[PDB]
Amino acid sequence: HHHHHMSVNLKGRSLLTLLDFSPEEIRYLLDISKQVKMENRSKLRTERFKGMTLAMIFEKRSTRTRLAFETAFAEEGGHPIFLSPNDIHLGAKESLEDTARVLGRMVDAIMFRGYKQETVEKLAEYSGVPVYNGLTDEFHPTQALADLMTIEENFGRLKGVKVVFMGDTRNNVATSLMIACAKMGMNFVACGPEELKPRSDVFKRCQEIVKETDGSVSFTSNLEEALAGADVVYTDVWARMALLKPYQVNERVMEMTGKSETIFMHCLPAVKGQEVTYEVIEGKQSRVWDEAENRKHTIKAVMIATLL
Amino acid sequence: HHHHHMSVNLKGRSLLTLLDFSPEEIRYLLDISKQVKMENRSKLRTERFKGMTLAMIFEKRSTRTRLAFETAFAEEGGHPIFLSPNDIHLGAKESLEDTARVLGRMVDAIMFRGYKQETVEKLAEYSGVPVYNGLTDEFHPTQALADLMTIEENFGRLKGVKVVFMGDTRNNVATSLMIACAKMGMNFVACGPEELKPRSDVFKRCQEIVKETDGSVSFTSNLEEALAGADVVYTDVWARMALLKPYQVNERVMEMTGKSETIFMHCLPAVKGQEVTYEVIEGKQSRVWDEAENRKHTIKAVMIATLL
Amino acid sequence: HHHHHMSVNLKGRSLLTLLDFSPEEIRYLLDISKQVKMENRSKLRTERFKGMTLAMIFEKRSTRTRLAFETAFAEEGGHPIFLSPNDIHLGAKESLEDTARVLGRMVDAIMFRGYKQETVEKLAEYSGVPVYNGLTDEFHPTQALADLMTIEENFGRLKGVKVVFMGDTRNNVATSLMIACAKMGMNFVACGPEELKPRSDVFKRCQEIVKETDGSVSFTSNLEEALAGADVVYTDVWARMALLKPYQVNERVMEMTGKSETIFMHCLPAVKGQEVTYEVIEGKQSRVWDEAENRKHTIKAVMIATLL
Amino acid sequence: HHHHHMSVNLKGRSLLTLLDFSPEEIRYLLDISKQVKMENRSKLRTERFKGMTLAMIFEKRSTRTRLAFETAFAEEGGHPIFLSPNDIHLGAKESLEDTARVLGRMVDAIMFRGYKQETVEKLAEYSGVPVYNGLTDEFHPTQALADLMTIEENFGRLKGVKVVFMGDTRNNVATSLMIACAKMGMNFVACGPEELKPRSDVFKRCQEIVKETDGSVSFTSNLEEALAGADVVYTDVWARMALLKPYQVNERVMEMTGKSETIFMHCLPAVKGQEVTYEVIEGKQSRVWDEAENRKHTIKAVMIATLL
């Protein structure tokens, strides 16, 4: 940038999207994730969040995201507070701004999962504490960090690696994955129907990302050219079905890589038989379970980086 | 057994039913329960589960079982996570196996309360961490341990003691009680209508238990012969009513013992006026409140034995 | 497996052979090993086994296995108890079952090194605590884990890697190495005289392992075809000598790799001049000393995984 | 005693024989034993002996006595030092007095197992630290405390209880058992051949004990009159065989009690088929395994009482 910005410190920051993070900040997050995974497996117990509190607002319920936040925080002595759709209707009894100002005076950090990205922004703005996007219909940044972690565990590197996302290429998970890949110098291909091609404003921002990172970002509706030499095949649920049906990840599709080392990934939950076959997700190339475990380690890292 | 098996260590084990436990293992559990009750009453505070997490899946809600697990775990510094029927529909969005594999990578232990015994088995199988049956429509092992603890507190022994269960003699609570009694060398009588006689496969397994333990297990529809010399009269809720109506525990029934030292027990909740009268459950032979307190101490013991 | 089993938790488990462990469980063990090596080198001291006790029964004495168990346990505050052949003759004054039942009531864990695999099984069965095979004349699982750790340290991966074992290809160390390789997707070749070819029941079980892991397992009496492209050449002591003499690892043999990056490994002790020359084991391709250090880190990991 | 002595404090005392202890001191020891058993089973970890050292001199090796001392001391943070017959020949290179004076300047406590009672006395005299008799050919006081503990666990009392020792009624274990029983107000009968009747000086001292304790001590060669109403049948190894053969504990003998509640006890090891049949020791009246576990809890109690 004439003087390139290279700081890694994230104390006080929110995680609304990976677009707000430098490659150096994401690498730092991935170092922490890897280190916290090792401490967890080795049963080195720590109390990094002792005395702290996290309000978790779920406009849409998710057991995986809840479990990841809740175990990450509480293993370190923090107290997580589960606010369900029955507890909290954010537009309903009170303005979002009223609720955010109160939360800001009561807790150390807020996690939000729901619909509007605007909701998470105003939480951050009006609470004045770190806010974590645990999924909006625009972005799922914590999933992308876990996916990166998983891929790096498998190939020992990220900068080379070719990742193909199959199907609904504009959904929250596909979007965050594209960004994460671009930031880490990866070769990302979006493969699905033209009706569901990547968001174009995000795609163009990723084309600027990769000019500095030597990654690539691409789209095609053609399976054959997308998949050749893929190190990772990734997919997510479909919910027309008729446009998406051809982009099912099955054995045939995996073989189109030309590489036996290819892995299969899926944020979960999956509708087995639809976007991926039983045989693939339950078989030897699947890394969905490590990927799931890595949700927790990445979330813990985000909280460590931003609260301490 | 030619060489009799006598080990007591339970580290890593699940509690799906007391059928999976030796008398020596159950005695060890009851020693821990008694010791943890004394530490709790004396306000000797410990942190045995510091840093650990327990996922509690309630397919059917219960405040007593929830309170017992949740206080037991958290008094020792563990973090319990309440997953309600609104949080989690186990067949619904995901296979049980998908959910169990994820849980296995995130928490130290799982508690389940629900319908199918098969559900708890597959949790254990696919998670690979200790799973605790907090009631299925087959067994309620934690209730039986609390009942044993209570009876021993009252008579200072178990091996002699005559226990009569009145009414629905094949329900989850009656079944687990019969097993617990058989294991501890007790004289258990099941008393209710023939339509609701003990499960026969469990009854026969208890007849083998008692050959080694010098206990007895029996059934009769005749009140008079069941009750003579009972040290414990036990009952549970009824939900035909018409077959069960005669087996109400009232003052008349308690007097059929011929012993003033007889106690009354009831896993709770009770429908007072139906299976037991107000006068009995609220009167001087009732031990239902100690029995309730002992839910917590027994659950803590199971968790101590299996996690540490 | 229709639903693939993927849990990593090992609490309460014994280590009798790596045949009892999934690739995912072994990967988890190797993560812990690597992490405990780093804590040890960095002088981050922990007390993971404070208050615990380990009985070590040596039917055959070994200073390396003793040192590894004893330092691993005691660095973490555990107390190891050395029972020598002079202390303990397991068939002699008492049945093995009598001794195991007593041990089970006194210690947290048992290590056994001796002759019969059956001995270690009955220890596990009758004590009811975790038992660790520190070598039987069938398997040496702790050595294999240390070998894996060493190989991964050297090549940064395991799934590709070609390992050749030279000589007595059916001994305890060769057998456990073959299994470990098969589990981790490695290309293992057994090279020695046909009289000493791999155990056939274990070989066939490894052929099933590798169908899921994309490894390979093989035998040949021909040196030239075994060694081409080996990343690891491994050997062990010979105690006819006359069948084994040709399979000495010397400079000529190492050069048959065609790769300068090839390493040499040997569980120790070695009879230098016999199965390996001085020049090789003392020279620049030898990794025997790191491999020896890794005995301790792998043993600590097994104990962490199974006791905590 | 005109003023009856009733103190319980044992700080600094040795355990050479239970003859040196009042009933009140033994009751205090049994309270501690019971309490330390509960802390151990509940995994309440303490460090009562942190920084302390215990020299264990085994003139005769015993794995049970070694394990009990060594686990008891080290669970509490003490360091036990195993001196075997190969380490130490007490008459041989040095007078016993030279060795005792040195030990006295180096360790906190000495355990001795061997031949002469005089040896343990001079250890105590010349070291000036607490000395524990872990068996001499005169007394085995730690075994007797464990036996008492076991009996009390089974009957909830000691003062009533009828204990029959069968066979070699003058050996170390029989002698210490008689004393323990006399002290605790128990009804002890020695049953074996007249050639092996109780030591007469110890028998007479026990007749004085029981005048204050309301116990009884007796001998007969007649099985039938010994056994009627026995709550405990106890035996030990025989090494003429021909005098002892009739006093084998078998099923016939156990039935001569006339009580189903009778338990079987044996300090171990046993020669099954000789002094006791397989069927009895492996069957439902055997309490040998609890008795073995109680060695550790009683030893810990002796060390707590005398060192702290």
Descriptive key words:
Rossmann fold; alpha/beta; 43% helix; 2 domains; 5-stranded parallel beta sheet; 308 residues; 4 chains; part of a larger assembly
Give an account of the 3D structure.
The structure is cut from a larger assembly and holds four copies of chain A (308 residues). Chain A is of the alpha/beta class and 308 residues long. Chain A folds into two domains: 1-139 and 287-308, Rossmann fold; 140-286, Rossmann fold. In chain A, 43% of the residues lie in helices and 14% in strands. The first copy, chain A, is built from twelve helices and nine strands. A five-stranded parallel β-sheet of chain A has the order 7-6-5-8-9. In chain A, strands 2-1-3-4 form a four-stranded parallel β-sheet, sandwiched between helices. In chain A, helix 1 crosses helix 12, helix 2 packs across helix 12 (288-307) and helix 5 crosses helix 12 (288-307). The longest helix of chain A has 20 residues, at 288-307. Chains in contact: A-B, A-C, B-C, B-D, C-D. Chains A and B meet through helix 2 and helix 12 of A and strand 2 and helix 3 of B.
